[PDB]
Every structure is written in C-alpha cells, then in structure tokens.
JSON list of C-alpha atoms and ligand atoms in Angstrom, two decimals:
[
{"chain": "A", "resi": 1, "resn": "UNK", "atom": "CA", "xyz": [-7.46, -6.88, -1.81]},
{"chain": "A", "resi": 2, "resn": "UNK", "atom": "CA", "xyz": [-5.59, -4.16, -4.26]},
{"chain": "A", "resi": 3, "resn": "UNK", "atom": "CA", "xyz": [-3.07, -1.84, -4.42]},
{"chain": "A", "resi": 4, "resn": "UNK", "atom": "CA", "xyz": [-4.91, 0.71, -3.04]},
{"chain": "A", "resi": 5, "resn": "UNK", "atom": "CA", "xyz": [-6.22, -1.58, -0.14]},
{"chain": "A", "resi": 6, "resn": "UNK", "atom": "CA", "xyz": [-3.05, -2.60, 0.73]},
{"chain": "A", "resi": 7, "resn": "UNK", "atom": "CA", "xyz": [-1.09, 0.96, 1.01]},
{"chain": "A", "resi": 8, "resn": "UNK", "atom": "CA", "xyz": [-4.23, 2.50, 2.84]},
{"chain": "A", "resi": 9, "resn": "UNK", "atom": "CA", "xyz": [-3.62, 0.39, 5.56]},
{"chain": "A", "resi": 10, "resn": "UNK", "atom": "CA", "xyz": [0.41, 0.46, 5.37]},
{"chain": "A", "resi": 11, "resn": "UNK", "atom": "CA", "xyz": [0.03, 5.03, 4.95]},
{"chain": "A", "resi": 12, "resn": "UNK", "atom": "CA", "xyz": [-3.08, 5.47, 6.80]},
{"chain": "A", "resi": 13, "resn": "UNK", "atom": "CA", "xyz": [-4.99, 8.64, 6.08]},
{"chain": "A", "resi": 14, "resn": "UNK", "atom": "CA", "xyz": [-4.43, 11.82, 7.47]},
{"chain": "A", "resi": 15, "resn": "UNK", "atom": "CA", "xyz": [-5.48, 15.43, 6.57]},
{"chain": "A", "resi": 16, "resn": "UNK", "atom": "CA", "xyz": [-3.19, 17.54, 7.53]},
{"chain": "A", "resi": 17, "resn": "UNK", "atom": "CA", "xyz": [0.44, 18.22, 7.25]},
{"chain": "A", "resi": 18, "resn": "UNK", "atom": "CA", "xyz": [2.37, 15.40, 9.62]},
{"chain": "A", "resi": 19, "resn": "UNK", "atom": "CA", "xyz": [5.96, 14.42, 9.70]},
{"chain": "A", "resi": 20, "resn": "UNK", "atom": "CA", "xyz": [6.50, 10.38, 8.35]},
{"chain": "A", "resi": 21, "resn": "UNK", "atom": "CA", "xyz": [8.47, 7.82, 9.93]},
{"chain": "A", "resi": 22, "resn": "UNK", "atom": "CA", "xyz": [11.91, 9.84, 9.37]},
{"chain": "A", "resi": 23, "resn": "UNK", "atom": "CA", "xyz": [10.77, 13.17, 10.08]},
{"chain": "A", "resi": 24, "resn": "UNK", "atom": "CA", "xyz": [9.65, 14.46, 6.55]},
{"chain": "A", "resi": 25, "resn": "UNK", "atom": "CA", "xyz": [6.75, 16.26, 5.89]},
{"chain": "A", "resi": 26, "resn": "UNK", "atom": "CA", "xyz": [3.75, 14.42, 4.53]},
{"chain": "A", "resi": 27, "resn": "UNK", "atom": "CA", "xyz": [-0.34, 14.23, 3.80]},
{"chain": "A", "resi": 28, "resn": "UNK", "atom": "CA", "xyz": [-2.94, 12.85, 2.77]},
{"chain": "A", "resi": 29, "resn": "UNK", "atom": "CA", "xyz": [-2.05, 8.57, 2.07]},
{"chain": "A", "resi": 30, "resn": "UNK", "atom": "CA", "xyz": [1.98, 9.55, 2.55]},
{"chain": "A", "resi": 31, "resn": "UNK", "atom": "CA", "xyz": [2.11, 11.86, -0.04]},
{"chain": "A", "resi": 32, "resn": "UNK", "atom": "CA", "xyz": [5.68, 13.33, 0.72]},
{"chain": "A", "resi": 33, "resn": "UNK", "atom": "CA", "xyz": [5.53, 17.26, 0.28]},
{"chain": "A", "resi": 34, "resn": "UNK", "atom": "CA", "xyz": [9.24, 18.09, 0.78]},
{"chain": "A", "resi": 35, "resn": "UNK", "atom": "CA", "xyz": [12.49, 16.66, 2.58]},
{"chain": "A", "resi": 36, "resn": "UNK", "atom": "CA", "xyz": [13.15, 20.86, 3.90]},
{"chain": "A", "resi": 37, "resn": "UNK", "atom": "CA", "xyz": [12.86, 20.84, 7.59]},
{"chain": "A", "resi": 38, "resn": "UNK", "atom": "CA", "xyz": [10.70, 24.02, 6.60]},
{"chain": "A", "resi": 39, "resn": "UNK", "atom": "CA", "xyz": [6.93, 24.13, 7.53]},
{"chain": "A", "resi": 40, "resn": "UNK", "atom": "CA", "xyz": [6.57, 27.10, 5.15]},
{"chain": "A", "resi": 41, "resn": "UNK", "atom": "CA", "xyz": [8.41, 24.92, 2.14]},
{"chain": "A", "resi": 42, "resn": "UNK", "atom": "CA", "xyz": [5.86, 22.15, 3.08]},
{"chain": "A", "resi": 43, "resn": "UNK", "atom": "CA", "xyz": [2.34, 24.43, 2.99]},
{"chain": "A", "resi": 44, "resn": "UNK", "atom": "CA", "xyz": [4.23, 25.93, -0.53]},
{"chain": "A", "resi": 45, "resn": "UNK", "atom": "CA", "xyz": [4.48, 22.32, -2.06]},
{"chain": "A", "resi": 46, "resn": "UNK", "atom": "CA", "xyz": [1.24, 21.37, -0.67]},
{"chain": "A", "resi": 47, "resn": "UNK", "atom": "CA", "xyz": [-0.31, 24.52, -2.42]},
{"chain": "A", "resi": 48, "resn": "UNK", "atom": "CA", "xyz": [1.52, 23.25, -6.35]},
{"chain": "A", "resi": 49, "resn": "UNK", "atom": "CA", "xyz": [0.11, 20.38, -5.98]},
{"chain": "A", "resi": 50, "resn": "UNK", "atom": "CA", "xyz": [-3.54, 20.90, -5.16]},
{"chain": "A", "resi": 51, "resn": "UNK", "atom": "CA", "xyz": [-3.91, 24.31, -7.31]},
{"chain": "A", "resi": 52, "resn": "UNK", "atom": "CA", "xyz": [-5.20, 25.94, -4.30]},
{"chain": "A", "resi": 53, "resn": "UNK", "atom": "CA", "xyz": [-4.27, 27.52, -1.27]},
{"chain": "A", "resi": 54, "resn": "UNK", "atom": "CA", "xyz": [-4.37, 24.93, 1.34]},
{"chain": "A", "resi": 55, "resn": "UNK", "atom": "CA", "xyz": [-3.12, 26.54, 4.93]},
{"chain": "A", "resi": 56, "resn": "UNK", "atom": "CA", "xyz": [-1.80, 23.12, 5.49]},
{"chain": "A", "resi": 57, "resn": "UNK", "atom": "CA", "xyz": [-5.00, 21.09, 4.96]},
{"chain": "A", "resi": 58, "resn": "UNK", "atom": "CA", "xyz": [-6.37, 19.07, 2.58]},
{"chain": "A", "resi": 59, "resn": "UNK", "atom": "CA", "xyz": [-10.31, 17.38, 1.63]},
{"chain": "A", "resi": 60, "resn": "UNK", "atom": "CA", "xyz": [-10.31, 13.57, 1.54]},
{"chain": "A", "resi": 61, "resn": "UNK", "atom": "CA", "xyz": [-11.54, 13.95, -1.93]},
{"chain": "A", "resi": 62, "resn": "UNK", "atom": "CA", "xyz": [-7.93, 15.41, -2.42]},
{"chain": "A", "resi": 63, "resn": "UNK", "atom": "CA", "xyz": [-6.10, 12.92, -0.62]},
{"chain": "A", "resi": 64, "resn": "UNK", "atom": "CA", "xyz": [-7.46, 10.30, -2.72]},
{"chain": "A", "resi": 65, "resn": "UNK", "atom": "CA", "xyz": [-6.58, 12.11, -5.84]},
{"chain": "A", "resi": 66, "resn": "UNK", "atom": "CA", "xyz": [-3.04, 12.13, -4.77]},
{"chain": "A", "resi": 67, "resn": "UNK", "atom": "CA", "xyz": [-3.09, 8.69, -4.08]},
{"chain": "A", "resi": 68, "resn": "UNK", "atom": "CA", "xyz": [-4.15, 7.85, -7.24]},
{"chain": "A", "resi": 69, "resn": "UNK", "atom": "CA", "xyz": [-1.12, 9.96, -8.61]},
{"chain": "A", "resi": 70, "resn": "UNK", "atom": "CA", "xyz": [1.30, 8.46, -6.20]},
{"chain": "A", "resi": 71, "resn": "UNK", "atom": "CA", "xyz": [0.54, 5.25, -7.43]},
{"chain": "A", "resi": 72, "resn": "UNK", "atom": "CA", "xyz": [0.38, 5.42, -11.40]},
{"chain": "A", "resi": 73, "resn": "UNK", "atom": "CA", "xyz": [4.05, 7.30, -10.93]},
{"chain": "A", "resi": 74, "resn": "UNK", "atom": "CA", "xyz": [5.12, 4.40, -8.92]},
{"chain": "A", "resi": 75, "resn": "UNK", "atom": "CA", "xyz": [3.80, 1.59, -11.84]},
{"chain": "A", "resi": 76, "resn": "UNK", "atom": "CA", "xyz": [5.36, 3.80, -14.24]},
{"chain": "A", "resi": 77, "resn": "UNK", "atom": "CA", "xyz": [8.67, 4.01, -12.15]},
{"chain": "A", "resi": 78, "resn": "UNK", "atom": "CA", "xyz": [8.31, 0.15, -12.45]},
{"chain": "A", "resi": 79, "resn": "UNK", "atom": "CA", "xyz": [7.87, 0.35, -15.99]},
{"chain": "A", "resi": 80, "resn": "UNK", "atom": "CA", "xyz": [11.00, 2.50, -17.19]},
{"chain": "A", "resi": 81, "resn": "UNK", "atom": "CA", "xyz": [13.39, 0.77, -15.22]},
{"chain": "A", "resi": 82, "resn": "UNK", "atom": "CA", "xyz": [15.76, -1.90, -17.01]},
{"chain": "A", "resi": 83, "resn": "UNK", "atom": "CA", "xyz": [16.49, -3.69, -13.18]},
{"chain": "A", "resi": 84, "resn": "UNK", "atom": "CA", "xyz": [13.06, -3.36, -12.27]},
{"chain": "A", "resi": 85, "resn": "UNK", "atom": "CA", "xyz": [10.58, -4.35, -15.47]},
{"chain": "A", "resi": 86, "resn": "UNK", "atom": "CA", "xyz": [11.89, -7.93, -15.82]},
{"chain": "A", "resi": 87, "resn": "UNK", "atom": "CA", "xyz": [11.17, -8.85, -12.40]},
{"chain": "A", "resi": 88, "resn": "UNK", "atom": "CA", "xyz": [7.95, -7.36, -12.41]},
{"chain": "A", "resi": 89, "resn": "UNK", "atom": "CA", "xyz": [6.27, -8.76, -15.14]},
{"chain": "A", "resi": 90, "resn": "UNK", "atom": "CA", "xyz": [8.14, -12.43, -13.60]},
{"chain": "A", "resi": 91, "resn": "UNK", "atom": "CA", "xyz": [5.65, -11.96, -10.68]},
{"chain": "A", "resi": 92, "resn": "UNK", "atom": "CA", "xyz": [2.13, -12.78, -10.15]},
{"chain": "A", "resi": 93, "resn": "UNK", "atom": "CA", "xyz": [-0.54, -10.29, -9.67]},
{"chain": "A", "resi": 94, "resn": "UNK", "atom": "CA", "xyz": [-0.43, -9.90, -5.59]},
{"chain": "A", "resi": 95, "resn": "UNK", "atom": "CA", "xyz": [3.34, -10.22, -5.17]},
{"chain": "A", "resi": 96, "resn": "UNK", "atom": "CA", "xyz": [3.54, -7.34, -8.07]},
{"chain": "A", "resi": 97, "resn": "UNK", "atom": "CA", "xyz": [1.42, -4.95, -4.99]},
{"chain": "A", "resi": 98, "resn": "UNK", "atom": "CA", "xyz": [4.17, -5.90, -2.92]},
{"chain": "A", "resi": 99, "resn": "UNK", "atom": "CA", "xyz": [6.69, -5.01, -5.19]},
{"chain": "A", "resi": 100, "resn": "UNK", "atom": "CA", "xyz": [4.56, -1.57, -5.86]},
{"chain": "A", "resi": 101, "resn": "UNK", "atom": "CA", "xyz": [4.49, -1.29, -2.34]},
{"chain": "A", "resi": 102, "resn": "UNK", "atom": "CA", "xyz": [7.91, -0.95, -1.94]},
{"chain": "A", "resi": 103, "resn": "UNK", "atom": "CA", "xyz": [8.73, 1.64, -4.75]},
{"chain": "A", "resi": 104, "resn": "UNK", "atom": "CA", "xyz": [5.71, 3.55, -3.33]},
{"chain": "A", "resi": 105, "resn": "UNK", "atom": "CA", "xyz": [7.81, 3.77, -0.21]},
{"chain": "A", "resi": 106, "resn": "UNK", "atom": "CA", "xyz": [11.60, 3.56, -1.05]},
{"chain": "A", "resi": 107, "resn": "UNK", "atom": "CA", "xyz": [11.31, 5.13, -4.68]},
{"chain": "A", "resi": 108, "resn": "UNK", "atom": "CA", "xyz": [12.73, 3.71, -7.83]},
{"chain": "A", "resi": 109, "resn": "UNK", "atom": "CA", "xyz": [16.09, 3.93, -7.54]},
{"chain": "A", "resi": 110, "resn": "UNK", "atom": "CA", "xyz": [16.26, 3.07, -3.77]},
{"chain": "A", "resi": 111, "resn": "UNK", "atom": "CA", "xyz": [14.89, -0.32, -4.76]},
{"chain": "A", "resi": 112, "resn": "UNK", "atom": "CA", "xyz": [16.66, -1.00, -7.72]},
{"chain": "A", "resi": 113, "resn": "UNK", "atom": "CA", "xyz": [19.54, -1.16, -5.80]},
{"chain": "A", "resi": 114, "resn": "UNK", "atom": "CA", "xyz": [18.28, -4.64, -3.82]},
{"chain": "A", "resi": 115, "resn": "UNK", "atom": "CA", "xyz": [19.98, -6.48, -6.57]},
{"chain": "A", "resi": 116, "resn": "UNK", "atom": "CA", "xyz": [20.46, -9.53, -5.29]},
{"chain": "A", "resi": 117, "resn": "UNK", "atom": "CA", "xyz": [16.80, -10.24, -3.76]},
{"chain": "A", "resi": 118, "resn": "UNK", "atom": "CA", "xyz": [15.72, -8.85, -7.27]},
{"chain": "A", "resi": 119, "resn": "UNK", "atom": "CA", "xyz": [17.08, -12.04, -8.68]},
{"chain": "A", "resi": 120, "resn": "UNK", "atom": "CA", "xyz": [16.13, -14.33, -6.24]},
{"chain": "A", "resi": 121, "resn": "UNK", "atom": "CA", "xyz": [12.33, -13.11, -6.88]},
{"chain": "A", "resi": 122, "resn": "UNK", "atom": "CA", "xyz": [13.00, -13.34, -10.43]},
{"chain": "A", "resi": 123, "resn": "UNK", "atom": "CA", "xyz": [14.15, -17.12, -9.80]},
{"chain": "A", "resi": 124, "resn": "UNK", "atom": "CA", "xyz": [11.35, -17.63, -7.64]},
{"chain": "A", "resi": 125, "resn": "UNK", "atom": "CA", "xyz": [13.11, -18.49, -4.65]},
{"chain": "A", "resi": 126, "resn": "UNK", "atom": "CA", "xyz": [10.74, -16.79, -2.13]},
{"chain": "A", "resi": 127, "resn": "UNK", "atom": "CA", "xyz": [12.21, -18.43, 1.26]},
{"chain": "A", "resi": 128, "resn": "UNK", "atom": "CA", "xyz": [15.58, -17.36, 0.37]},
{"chain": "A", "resi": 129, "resn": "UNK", "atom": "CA", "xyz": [14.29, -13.86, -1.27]},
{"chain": "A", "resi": 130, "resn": "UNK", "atom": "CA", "xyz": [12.37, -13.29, 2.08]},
{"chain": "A", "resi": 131, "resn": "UNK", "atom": "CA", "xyz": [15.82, -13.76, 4.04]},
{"chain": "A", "resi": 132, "resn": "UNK", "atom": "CA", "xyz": [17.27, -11.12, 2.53]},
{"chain": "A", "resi": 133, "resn": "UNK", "atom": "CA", "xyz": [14.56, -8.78, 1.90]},
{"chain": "A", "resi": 134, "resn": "UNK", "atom": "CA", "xyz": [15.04, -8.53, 6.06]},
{"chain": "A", "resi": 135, "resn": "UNK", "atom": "CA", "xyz": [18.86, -8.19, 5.87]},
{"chain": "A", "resi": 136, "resn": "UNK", "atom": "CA", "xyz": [18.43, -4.36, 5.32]},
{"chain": "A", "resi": 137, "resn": "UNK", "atom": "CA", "xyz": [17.79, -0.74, 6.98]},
{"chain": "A", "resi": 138, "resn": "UNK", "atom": "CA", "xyz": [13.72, -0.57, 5.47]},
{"chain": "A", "resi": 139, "resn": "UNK", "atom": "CA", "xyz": [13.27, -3.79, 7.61]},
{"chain": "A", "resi": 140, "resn": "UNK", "atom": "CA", "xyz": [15.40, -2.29, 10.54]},
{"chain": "A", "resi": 141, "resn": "UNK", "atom": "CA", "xyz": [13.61, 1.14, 10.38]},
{"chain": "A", "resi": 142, "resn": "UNK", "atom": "CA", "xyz": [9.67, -0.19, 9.74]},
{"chain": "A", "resi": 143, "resn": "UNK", "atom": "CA", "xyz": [9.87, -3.87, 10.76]},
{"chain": "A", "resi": 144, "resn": "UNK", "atom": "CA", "xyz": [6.15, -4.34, 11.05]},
{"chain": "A", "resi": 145, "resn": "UNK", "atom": "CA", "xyz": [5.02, -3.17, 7.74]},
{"chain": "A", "resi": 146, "resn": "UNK", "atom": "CA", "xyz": [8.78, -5.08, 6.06]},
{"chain": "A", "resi": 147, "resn": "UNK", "atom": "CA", "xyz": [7.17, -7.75, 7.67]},
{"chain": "A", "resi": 148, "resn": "UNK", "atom": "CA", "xyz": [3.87, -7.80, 5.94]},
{"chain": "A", "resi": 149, "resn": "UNK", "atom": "CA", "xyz": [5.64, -6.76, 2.12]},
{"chain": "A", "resi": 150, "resn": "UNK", "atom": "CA", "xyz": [7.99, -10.10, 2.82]},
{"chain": "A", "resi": 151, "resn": "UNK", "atom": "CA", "xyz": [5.15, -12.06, 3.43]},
{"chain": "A", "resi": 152, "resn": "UNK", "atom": "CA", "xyz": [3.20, -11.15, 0.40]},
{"chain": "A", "resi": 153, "resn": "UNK", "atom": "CA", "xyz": [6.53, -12.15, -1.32]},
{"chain": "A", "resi": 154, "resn": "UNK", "atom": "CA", "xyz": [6.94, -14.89, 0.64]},
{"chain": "A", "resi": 155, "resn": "UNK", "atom": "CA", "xyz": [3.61, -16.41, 0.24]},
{"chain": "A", "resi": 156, "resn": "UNK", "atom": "CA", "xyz": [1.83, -14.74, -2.49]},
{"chain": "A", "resi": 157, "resn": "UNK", "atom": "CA", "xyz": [-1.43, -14.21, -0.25]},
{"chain": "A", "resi": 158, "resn": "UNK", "atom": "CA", "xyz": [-2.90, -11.54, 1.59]},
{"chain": "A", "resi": 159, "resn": "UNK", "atom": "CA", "xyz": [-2.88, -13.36, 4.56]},
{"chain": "A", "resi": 160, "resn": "UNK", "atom": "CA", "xyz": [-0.57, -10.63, 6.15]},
{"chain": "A", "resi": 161, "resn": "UNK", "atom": "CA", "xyz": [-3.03, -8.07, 5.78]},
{"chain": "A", "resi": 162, "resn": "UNK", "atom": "CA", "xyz": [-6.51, -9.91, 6.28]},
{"chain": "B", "resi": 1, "resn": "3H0", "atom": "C1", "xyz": [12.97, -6.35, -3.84]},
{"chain": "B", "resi": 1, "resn": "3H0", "atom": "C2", "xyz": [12.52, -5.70, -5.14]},
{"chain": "B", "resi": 1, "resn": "3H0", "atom": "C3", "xyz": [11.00, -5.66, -5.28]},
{"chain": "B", "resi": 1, "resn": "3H0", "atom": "C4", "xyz": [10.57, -5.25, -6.69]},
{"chain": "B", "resi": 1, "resn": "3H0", "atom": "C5", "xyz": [10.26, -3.93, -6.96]},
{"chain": "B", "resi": 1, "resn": "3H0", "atom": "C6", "xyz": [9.87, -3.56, -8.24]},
{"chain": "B", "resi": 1, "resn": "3H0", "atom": "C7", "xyz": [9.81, -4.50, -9.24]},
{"chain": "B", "resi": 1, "resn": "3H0", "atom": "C8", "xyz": [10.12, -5.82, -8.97]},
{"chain": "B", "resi": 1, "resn": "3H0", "atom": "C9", "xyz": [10.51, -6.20, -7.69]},
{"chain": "B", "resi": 2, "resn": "CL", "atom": "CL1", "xyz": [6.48, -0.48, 10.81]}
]
C-alpha cells in the first residue's frame, strides 16, 4: 500500500460534482471545489482548475491529475510547517501516509493544532497518541475512517485497510 492507495479508498472516486461529508462541494478523489453553498461557484472553480469548461463533470484521467495535486500540496503543507516537519520526519514510512492522510483531509493548520497527540507521536507513545487522536470532533464526525488513520498510528501496518 501507498498514499495514493490508501486515500482512494478513504475519498472514493466520483465524477461529478457531489457534496462531502459536511455538505461542501467536491469531485473527483475529494477534491474540494468551494465552501459557497453555490452550485454555480462550484461548476466556476471546477472550470479554473481543469482549463476547460466542465458543466460539472470531469474524465477520470482528470480526477487523477487532481489527486496527484492534492497530494504533493498536502507533503508540501507538511514540509513548511515548524509544528508539523519534526514529527514527520520522527515517523516511519506508513505512519507518515497516515499523517498525510490527515492534512489531506483537515488541512494544515487544522492539524497543527492537535498539539498534544503531535508530541506523543513524536515520543512514540502510540497507545496513548491513539487515545487522544479519538478525543476529538474528526473522530466524532467520520469515526470509521478516524478509526483506520489511528490504527495506522497505532500499529504502523496496513492491517486497517487490507
Ligand atoms: C496528529 C498529527 C498527525 C501529523 C500530521 C502531519 C505531520 C505529523 C503528524
Ligand atoms: Cl467515516
């Protein structure tokens, strides 16, 4: 498993314009267009970022060029943040997808703001990291996938999504 393994399954794949887990419209692998509640702001964001004039629908050739995007911002994200770096380059290879998981999902600054499971990972405490990892909204709001992030954390394996 990879990166890109691993978020395909968590985003799924869809080719038209759909609204995420908290209403927001989205394509492609989760590709957020636009927080507006406006369908017509959505299609004009979809349109800047292919170069084209979509009507709301994309090629999977597209999707997975967004992907691609989505995830070299979110390493770079990673990568430019003083919390974040350190941690990061603590961790082993799989738990660093989890971590890119998470800032794929949350952005940068929403998870630079876990502070205190930040250092736990960093100490590699992973029982006590997974504890609180849970104590929060993101595991509230999308238990199953939290779930499968904490285990990767909590195990370095993939065993939560073989
Ligand atoms: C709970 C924080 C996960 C994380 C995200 C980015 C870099 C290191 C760790
Ligand atoms: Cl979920």
């Amino acid at each position: 498993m990879n990166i890109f393994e691993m978020l395909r399954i968590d985003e799924g794949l869809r080719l038209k314009i759909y609204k995420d887990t908290e209403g927001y419209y989205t394509i492609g692998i989760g590709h957020l267009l636009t927080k507006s509640p406006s369908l017509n702001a959505a299609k004009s964001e979809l349109d800047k970022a292919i170069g084209r004039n979509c009507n709301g629908v994309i090629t999977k050739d597209e999707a997975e060029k967004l992907f691609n995007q989505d995830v070299d911002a979110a390493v770079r994200g990673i990568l430019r943040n003083a919390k974040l770096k350190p941690v990061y380059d603590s961790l082993d290879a799989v738990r660093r997808c989890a971590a890119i998981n998470m800032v794929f999902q949350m952005g940068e600054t929403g998870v630079a703001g876990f502070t205190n499971s930040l250092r736990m990972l960093q100490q590699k405490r992973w029982d006590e990291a997974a504890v609180n990892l849970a104590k929060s909204r993101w595991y509230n709001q999308t238990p199953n996938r939290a779930k499968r992030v904490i285990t990767t954390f909590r195990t370095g394996t993939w065993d939560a999504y073989k």
